[PDB]
Amino acid sequence: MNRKERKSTILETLMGDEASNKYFKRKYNEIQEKS
Amino acid sequence: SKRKEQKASQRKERLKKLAKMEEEKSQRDKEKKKEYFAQN
Amino acid sequence: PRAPRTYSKTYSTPKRPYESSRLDAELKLAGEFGLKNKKEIYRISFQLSKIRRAARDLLTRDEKDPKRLFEGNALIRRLVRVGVLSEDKKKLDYVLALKVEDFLERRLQTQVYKLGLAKSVHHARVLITQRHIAVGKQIVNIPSFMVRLDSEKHIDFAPTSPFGGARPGRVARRNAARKAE
Amino acid sequence: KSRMQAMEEYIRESSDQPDWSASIGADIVNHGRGGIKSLRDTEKERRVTSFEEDNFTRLNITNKAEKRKQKQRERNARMNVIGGEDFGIFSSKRKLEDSTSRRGAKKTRSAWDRAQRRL
Amino acid sequence: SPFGGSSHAKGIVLEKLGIESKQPNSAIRKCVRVQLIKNGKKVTAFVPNDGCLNFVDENDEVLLAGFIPGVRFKVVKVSGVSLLALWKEKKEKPR
Amino acid sequence: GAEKALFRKNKGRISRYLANKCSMASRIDNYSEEPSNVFGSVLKKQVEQRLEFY
Amino acid sequence: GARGGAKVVIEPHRHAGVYIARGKEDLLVTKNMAPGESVYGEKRISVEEPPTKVEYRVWNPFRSKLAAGIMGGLDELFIAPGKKVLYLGAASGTSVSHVSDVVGPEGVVYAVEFSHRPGRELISMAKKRPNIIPIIEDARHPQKYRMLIGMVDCVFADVAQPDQARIIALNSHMFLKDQGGVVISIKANCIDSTVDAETVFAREVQKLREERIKPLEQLTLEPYERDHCIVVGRYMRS
Amino acid sequence: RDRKLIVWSTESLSPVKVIPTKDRRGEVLSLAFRKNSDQLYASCADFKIRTYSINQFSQLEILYGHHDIVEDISALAMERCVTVGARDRTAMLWKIPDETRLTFRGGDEPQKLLRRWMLFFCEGSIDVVSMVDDFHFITGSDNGNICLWSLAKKKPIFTERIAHGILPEPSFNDISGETDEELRKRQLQGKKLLQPFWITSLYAIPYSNVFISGSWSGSLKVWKISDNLRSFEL
Amino acid sequence: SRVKKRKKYQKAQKKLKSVRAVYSGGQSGVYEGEKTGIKKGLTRSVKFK
Amino acid sequence: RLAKQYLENLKSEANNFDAGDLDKDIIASRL
Amino acid sequence: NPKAFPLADAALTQQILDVVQQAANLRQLKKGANEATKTLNRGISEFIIMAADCEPIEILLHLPLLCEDKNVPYVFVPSRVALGRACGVSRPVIAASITTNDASAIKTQIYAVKDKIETLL
Amino acid sequence: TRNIPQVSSALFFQYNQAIKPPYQVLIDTNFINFSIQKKVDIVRGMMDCLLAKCNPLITDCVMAELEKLGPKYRIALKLARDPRIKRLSCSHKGTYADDCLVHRVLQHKCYIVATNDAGLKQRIRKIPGIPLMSVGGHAYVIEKLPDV
RNA sequence: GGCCCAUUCGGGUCUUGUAAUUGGAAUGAGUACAAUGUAAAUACCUUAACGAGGAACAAUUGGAGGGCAAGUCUGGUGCCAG
Known about the structure:
part of a larger assembly; 12 chains; C: 9 helices; about 50% helix; I: mainly alpha; RNA-binding; ribosome; SSU processome; RNA-protein interactions
């Protein structure tokens, strides 16, 4: 992976991934509707 | 929590099938102990 | 009238059709070789049983007997022409070591799948039943055709078939005609 | 009657004379529905053609004589030939030894007959 | 043998003894009294269901086959037509 | 050597062509107890013929 | 998957000297005896420790049959810290280096090889690991190199030969301790391709037993390899 | 290799017809005219023989039976044309009207040849064929073997091993790059690397007792067959 | 019958990779680790007593 | 040996001229 | 002693050159030195075939190192020139690789030849 | 550490796709006696039953239970020691055979078990892919071998 | 999320599901121009054109489980049970 993508801690690398963020924003909205 | 619920769902289905098999092995077992002691 | 005729069955129902090991045995044999039914498995088991029974009877006879030698060598010569037994197993004990899977491997549909002419065993069966496969020069639509070695190499696509050099099928020419129109 | 099929193939391998093999596709009876034509039945048909060529006319098969010359000849196939070579002669039982045996009157019967043979 | 050597026996439908039963598809509602023709002995027979009970009527030919314990006979066949064919809307009873 | 351009459309063809021959020279050098330059000298010469044509 | 920036958590395995790296994927890894380099191009972890930069190597189970056994879940692995190990059939440092990592500096690895060509790289690997003793000699004749091997606690034999059981026995009698470890890798095709795998493994466990090895375990190495297993046994001289 | 059989007028080399083989692998490898006839027989790489009537410019029939490519083809006055199947190491003679074939195999092995002697190379392929006679034909193998055949016998009646000799041994300066002289010599492996010349050509004058073989040894060898047709000499 | 049994066999193939591991050509490309995770305290081991 | 005895047995089971050959000659002369 | 070792005898080469030929027909054959290396790198090579008269030999002695690391058989034929036609290809081949396929039409004689190659080794 | 034994790779569910001719058959103590009783002596009695060559194996235990039997069962001992009968040596303390016989088929799915003791039969019936052969009537019978 | 095993509690395992959309090919039954065939004719063989997405060009048989009402009946220790 590229130097810019690299992060000191795991979570920031998960922050750069746009697909994980899009995937999850859908799920959090869906669960809150049920709650 | 959806997966733990799935186990309980297939749990109930199996034990009904399970309680069917033991019933057959109970009735057929009584039959054998009638044919066996028929000789005796 | 005139004399009647001798005909017999090519198969026999198993001793017990209902043991689970048997059932899943036909399951995987069918699935891997893509058969229609268990009738073919009973067929093939029938001749494999006949062949092994003859081989066992020939084993029981002492070495160098006219019977054992003549008929055992004839079993093995024919079993090697069918391609089931390789040239290096020219012995009758290795006839007794045979299994149904080898015969099934000799079935033409296996070869049509296997050489690369078809991409699924069911596709191979469809191609055979659809007049696309020629063993040498002659068209066969029976998947149960067993193949010899010299016949094994001569499996090709038909001259009359659209994929083998003939004109496109009805669907292709129909589509081209409507496209032109 | 004396001929036993399994014996003559040994002559074929030991003859050292070629065998006149036919084409791969020319042997199948009917699109594969009938298996590869056995060696014997190829010997019978050529008799028809070698018979048919000279007579100048074909031979039709009578409706009666029909009813005992194709089915069993193509059902012995379905019982016994799997790929144009017969699996049937073995389930059958025959005394081939008589065919092998020098049963003729010219047979070793006394010590002097065999000694003359050894000469 | 229940039929004295035969696999099936015809009879005469006398009266449907379970018509007055309240409970639908009760075991009783499928019971019918039948006169065996070969000897005239009255017997009781099973009809597959209350829907099939509609098809059977009094003074029709009925064939009986081996099967409310004790009712050993079932009605398989009536008046030129088999019940299951009628029950599947595959046929009409001839009259 | 594509990060420091050690071997460096027509230019790329020469770079690969030299890469193929460099692989061979390593094989000769590595699996020879006393490697010589006789094969290296010629194996450079075809590269020179290769260069001239392009 | 395991890409350069991706960060992992190293935590110990059940077996001493074996470690697990967590993340989006889980990796079997062993600490590097020679930090800063890879032996067969394998993947590496570097951890900052008070700060010293300790280094850990990725163990590819497909390449290493022993690692596939760990993935298979071996109950007992005699290869452990402070233990002498005799590695038979050491083609190169692909697996021996990892075994060298597990034993540690206190331990040593007696790597035995026959073919000269793989031996040269194995010797080059052997220098970088002071604990590895390369023996480029035929394992069928342990008397040839009895001169070079001291008394050993465990024997690992990955020789792909038909006469492996004889090789294992002779080395076990000469070198292996009483109650010592025996761990073998068996391929069916080389020993006997005519018959199925299962009968072969039954035959091999039989041969070990006349040789006074008590076999403890067996593991087929699927999904990583067809027709393998690892059998673990104890040498019962008495 | 264009999968076409085209005909020209002899006078002007003007093309009059093209006959496609109608096969992707039907690369024609040899052509033989029936002597004193318009019949043409074509051997094509798709394991088949194509027979044409050139006066009609039409295809007649196809022959099937060969285990590998049909490299060569030779015919005489009658229609009994002979073939060789390359890696098949088998020679096949054809009756076009009857459609049957006679199949001929070599079946020699260096193991037995050496023991009877007490460099013999196993045949890898038959390369050429020419019909000496309507009842006799000769073949050339890739091991340098010239074999005489008869319709009576499957096996060769007489064979001439390494007819064209052995190829020159590779130079020691090229086998390896090692500096020392002796190291490169070991790479030669004595005489184990040496291989025989291939029989690229083999032609027999029809109905005669002599035939000619060809290779790149640098010379055409003329052979004479015995009066009894049981052997031949150089 | 042929289409039904094809779905039955492939389904049974889906069924066995659940109960036990099967080879799928081995490693394909770079080794990307154990996808399903590693269980430290679990052994799948068939023990000789 | 056993093969030869069968051939000798077969030969036992099985001025010189052939009736068919004479017919064939007339057929050939007509040809 | 020789670098080209083991070298198949006259007979064994013929069966090897046979299995090579049907493989070319069945698309199971990767030929040339670098393709052999690639088939080796991915571990799809059941065994490789190389030529003993390569000029020079040293340009294919990498492959024995690769195979013996991983336990793949290898064997030498006297002629790179002969190994060409068996591949079905218009130029000489010094090294070729038959790949692993349990789904191939020609498996039986491959394992027969693959049986012999280890015995030679 | 928890241990969950792997299901053998020789099993597609409860079919054993490894046992093929020639077979390996283990002999139980009762089997030799019943074979003598029905006069179905050992090697061919299989050959008729299975139509394949098998390799009879007698364990150190089974050779031992045959030999606890005593002078009344001498015939079983000489038949048990036939050279065609190979021997499967044992490395467990107990001489108890029924646990001995079953435990091998637990490891390796490559054997048939020969037995008439009802004590030992159902143990083999739960475990998948272990064909079970017995002597009944006038000849041997094989229950869980579909290849027959 | 799929599934396996487990009287019991639970345990084991990973690319699975569609009761979603979509694309181009092949051909058989049928619709049939012919020749051949034959005392004539039927038939057989061969052979022009047309012929598939619900490919409705719409095979069956038997068995095992469900679930639904402002529905009906019966018995009881609310809201249950049959």
